[PDB]
């Protein structure tokens, strides 16, 4: 029974919320520009773009 | 007393009573014998009941 209550108290110590979001994998930031090339060019595919013009 | 082709001393009540007490508590202890400690305790799993097949 003491093992029971002990496990209980374990749960009570551990049922507390995590202080924040916690680290995992944020490694290697994605390219901003290959994304833009996919977006634009694959959407610009087969188009007669005249650059930007004034 | 004439038990018919037998005659007997009259038993103490306490004798048979002790027989009852002893045999009963013996049934208790025997219930504790070849039965106990099969439900093995766990804080997590709780009591366990091993089998070749449950």
UniProtKB/Swiss-Prot annotation, chain A:
It is found in: Nucleus. It comes from the Eukaryota. Component of the Mediator complex. Belongs to the Mediator complex subunit 22 family. Component of the Mediator complex, a coactivator involved in the regulated transcription of nearly all RNA polymerase II-dependent genes. Mediator functions as a bridge to convey information from gene-specific regulatory proteins to the basal RNA polymerase II transcription machinery. Mediator is recruited to promoters by direct interactions with regulatory proteins and serves as a scaffold for the assembly of a functional preinitiation complex with RNA polymerase II and the general transcription factors. This is Mediator of RNA polymerase II transcription subunit 22. It comes from Schizosaccharomyces pombe (strain 972 / ATCC 24843) (Fission yeast). The chain holds residues 69 to 122 of 136 of the full protein.
Swiss-Prot record, chain B:
GO terms for biological process: positive regulation of transcription initiation by RNA polymerase II; regulation of transcription by RNA polymerase II. One of its GO terms (molecular function) is transcription coactivator activity. Keywords: Activator, Nucleus, Transcription, Transcription regulation. It comes from the Eukaryota. GO terms for cellular component: core mediator complex; mediator complex. It is found in: Nucleus. Its main location: nucleus. The keyword Transcription applies. The keyword Nucleus applies. Belongs to the Mediator complex subunit 6 family. Component of the Mediator complex, a coactivator involved in the regulated transcription of nearly all RNA polymerase II-dependent genes. Mediator functions as a bridge to convey information from gene-specific regulatory proteins to the basal RNA polymerase II transcription machinery. Mediator is recruited to promoters by direct interactions with regulatory proteins and serves as a scaffold for the assembly of a functional preinitiation complex with RNA polymerase II and the general transcription factors. Component of the Mediator complex. This is Mediator of RNA polymerase II transcription subunit 6. The lineage of its organism: Eukaryota, Fungi, Dikarya, Ascomycota, Taphrinomycotina. The chain holds residues 109 to 162 of 216 of the full protein.
């Amino acid at each position: 029974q003491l093992l029971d209550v002990s496990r209980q108290i374990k749960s009570y110590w551990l049922t507390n919320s995590l202080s924040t979001s916690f680290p995992t994998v944020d490694y290697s930031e994605p390219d901003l520009e290959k994304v833009k090339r996919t977006l634009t060019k694959l959407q610009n595919h087969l188009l007669e773009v005249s650059l930007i013009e004034p | 007393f004439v038990c018919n082709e037998n005659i007997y001393m009259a038993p103490n009540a306490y004798t048979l009573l002790a027989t009852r007490m002893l045999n009963a508590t013996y049934c208790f202890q025997k219930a504790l014998t070849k039965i106990e400690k099969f439900p093995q305790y766990n804080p997590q799993e709780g009591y366990t009941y091993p089998k070749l097949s449950n």
